């Protein structure tokens, strides 16, 4: 196709189907209510995704939006793909250490705000109002990743010996590849454009990757997604 | 009004707020909690298709999408009340049996993705990707009906003879009628465009309406909805 | 700015930033675990509520629709501030009187329709229909003001007195401000037009700021938001 960022989304599209249809497989016949759980989550992620980056690489998911006189490619499906997929990642945390009702409803709500921010900033027309944005969005992404170190790591440790290393390793894995994104967003062509798009998108192909099919392959090969049983 | 499928539009408001009132009036005074929530799940159901089945009739609900060389009428509003409802009648079918949460989810997931992906496919521009669409909603719904039967029938026998006697009927019903909707877009203006738009409104308001209200008249008559007491 | 309505949006973001980080900070150490849920739901309620008066202040949340001749300001944001604000107010009360599930369902299914069939009433170009709607989405509320007044009024009084007391009077602030919305849009510039759009943003932010930050106020200060416990 004539957009040179269409390798990294090939490329993406067929990793997540990839990721999916493993999952997928994987899953057959677990029966332990518990592991049931942890595989619904982890397997829908890849597939959202899988539809998200097919749109994009089919030309649906992208849009121009006008902002420093010029007409920029913004792709908005990775905002669709996002506010489903992050919440049901922080899920899987979070049944993992078994956290309470309120503490869910807190990340999901931030992390919603994260997401719905972000897009807004995304397609806003004023320069400067982009970075207003972008500043709301990473503070309810700091105030996740606190919940995450300051709440939960916690309550990991008064868990099961498997539980707490399985969290401590997604935790680590989560904090640092999340933390990357609004430096990506910022560098790149809805910021201050010194990243060029084709290399943004391989960027967060990268990322996308590692944050969805990564993630799962710890968690889903672990023991902590069982019910103790004889 | 100047649509010649504006009769079936008509019907189909008056058909579901006729179903809403029905329901709603049946549930008065039930205090069973176990019936309060089939209740609830099944008469908000036409409800909802009442207010999109009334904004197609009205023109809300209407737009051109380009392809083929011509202007092509779509009602997306279809999609809006399907993303709502679908899964509330999975979830009738769901608390029937007393499925596991993890089997909830990658229901309600999938059904998510086989809206979603069926409202790409209306909105495309390019011809063939509409089918690529419809494939992969297909595929989704394939899932979700292999779910209702390799899944739900066997914690169904294992329950109240009422409530599996229940099911049964219910599943038959749903994968009947669930099954001709892939066959009507594929052949009506959002596909190949061999049945006119007025003739494809007549089907769809068939089934929406033997879906929802003749679904809810079956399983709000049953036994199955009340839990066992003296 | 040039819009003469900028005081009060001005206004009401400063208000909603400051109610989001008195109950955020009020929040901290908070453990026990039914006061965690309350104030997730009521802090999450000014945040979301911030950042969509934010969007109004600097332009994004504003569309014009082309309605009796003239081409109307419309800020839509409202509505996709209240979609997710309004179900949480409800869940703060039925959470407080330990609702049944089903009743929840109602109510959040409900609140759906009046925050739904709002949106397609301000968005939509035919005049008289626009009235069409806003009756529509009036009979919801009215549905929900019943539940709250009788059914929720009697499972209270068989609850912990202080659960009692606080529920009848958050009941009533919530009875009396909602019921001024359906007024307010009707006699504004979304309906007939004899209220100017500065007078009626006033309006609003008055009723927005009262609903969830007053509302808020009287809720964390109560002692029924913990359990009992020595
Ligand atoms: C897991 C095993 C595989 C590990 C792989 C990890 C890759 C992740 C990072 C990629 C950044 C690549 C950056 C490529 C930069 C090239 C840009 C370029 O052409 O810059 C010149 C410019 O045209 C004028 O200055
Ligand atoms: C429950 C009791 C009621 C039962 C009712 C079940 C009806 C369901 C099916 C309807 C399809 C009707 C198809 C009508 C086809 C007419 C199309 C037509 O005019 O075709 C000629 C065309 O113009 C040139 O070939
Ligand atoms: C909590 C302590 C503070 C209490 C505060 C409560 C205020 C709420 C009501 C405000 C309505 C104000 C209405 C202002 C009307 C002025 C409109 C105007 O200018 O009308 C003339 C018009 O130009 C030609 O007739
Ligand atoms: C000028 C001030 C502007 C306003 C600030 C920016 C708003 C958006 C940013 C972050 C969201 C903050 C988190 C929102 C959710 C709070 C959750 C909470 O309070 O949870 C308590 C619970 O006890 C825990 O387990
Ligand atoms: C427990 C549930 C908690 C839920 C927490 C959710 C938080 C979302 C809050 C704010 C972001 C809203 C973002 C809305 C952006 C809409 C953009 C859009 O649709 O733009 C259309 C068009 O391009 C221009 O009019
Ligand atoms: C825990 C994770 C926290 C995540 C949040 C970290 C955000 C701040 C980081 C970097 C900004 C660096 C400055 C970027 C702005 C550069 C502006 C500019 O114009 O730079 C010129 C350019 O370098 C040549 O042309
Ligand atoms: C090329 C490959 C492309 C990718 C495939 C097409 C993607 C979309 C289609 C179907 C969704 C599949 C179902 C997704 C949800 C899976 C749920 C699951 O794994 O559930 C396990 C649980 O144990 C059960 O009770
Ligand atoms: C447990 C929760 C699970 C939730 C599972 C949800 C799955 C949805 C996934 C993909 C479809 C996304 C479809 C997005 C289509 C947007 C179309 C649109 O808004 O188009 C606007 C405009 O016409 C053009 O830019
Ligand atoms: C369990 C439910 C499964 C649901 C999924 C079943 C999908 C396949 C079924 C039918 C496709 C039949 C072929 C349709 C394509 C016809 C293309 C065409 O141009 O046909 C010419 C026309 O007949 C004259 O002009
Ligand atoms: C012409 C007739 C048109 C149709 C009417 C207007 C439709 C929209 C208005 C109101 C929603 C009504 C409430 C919908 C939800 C009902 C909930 C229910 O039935 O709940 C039972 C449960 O037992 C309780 O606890
Ligand atoms: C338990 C879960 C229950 C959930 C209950 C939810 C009830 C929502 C029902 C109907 C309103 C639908 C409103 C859809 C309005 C869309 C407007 C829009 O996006 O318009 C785009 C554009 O301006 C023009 O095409
Ligand atoms: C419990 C809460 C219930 C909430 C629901 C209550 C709705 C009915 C109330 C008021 C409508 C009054 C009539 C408004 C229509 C006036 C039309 C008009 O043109 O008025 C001329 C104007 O007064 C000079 O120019
Ligand atoms: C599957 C992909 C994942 C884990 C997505 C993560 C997304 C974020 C952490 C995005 C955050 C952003 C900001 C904090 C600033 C504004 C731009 C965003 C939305 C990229
Ligand atoms: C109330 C109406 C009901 C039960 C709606 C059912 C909808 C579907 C089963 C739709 C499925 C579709 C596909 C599987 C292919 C693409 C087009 C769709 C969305 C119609
Ligand atoms: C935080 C703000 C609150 C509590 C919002 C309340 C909103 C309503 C009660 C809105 C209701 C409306 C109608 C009943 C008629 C049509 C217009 C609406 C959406 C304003």
Chains 1, 2, 3 share one sequence.
Do not use: C, H
């Amino acid at each position: 196709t004539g957009r040179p960022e269409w390798i990294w989304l090939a490329l993406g599209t067929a990793l997540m189907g990839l990721g999916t249809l493993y999952f997928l497989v994987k899953g057959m016949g677990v029966s332990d209510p518990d592991a049931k759980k942890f595989y619904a989550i982890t397997t829908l992620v890849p597939a959202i995704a899988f539809t998200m980056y097919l749109s994009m690489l089919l030309g649906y998911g992208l849009t121009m939006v006008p902002f420093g006189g010029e007409q920029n490619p913004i792709y908005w499906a990775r905002y669709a793909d996002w506010l489903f997929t992050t919440p049901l990642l922080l899920l899987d945390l979070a049944l993992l250490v078994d956290a309470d009702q309120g503490t869910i409803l807190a990340l999901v709500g931030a992390d919603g705000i994260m997401i719905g921010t972000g897009l807004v900033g995304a397609l806003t027309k004023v320069y400067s109002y982009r970075f207003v944005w972008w500043a709301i969005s990473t503070a309810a992404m700091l105030y996740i990743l606190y919940v995450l170190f300051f709440g939960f790591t916690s309550k990991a440790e008064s868990m099961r010996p498997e539980v707490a290393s399985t969290f401590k390793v997604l935790r680590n894995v989560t904090v640092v590849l999340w933390s990357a994104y609004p430096v990506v967003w910022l560098i790149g062509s809805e910021g201050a454009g010194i990243v060029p798009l084709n290399i943004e998108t391989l960027l967060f192909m990268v990322l996308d990757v590692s944050a969805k099919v990564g993630f799962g392959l710890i968690l889903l090969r672990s023991r902590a997604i069982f019910g103790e049983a004889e």
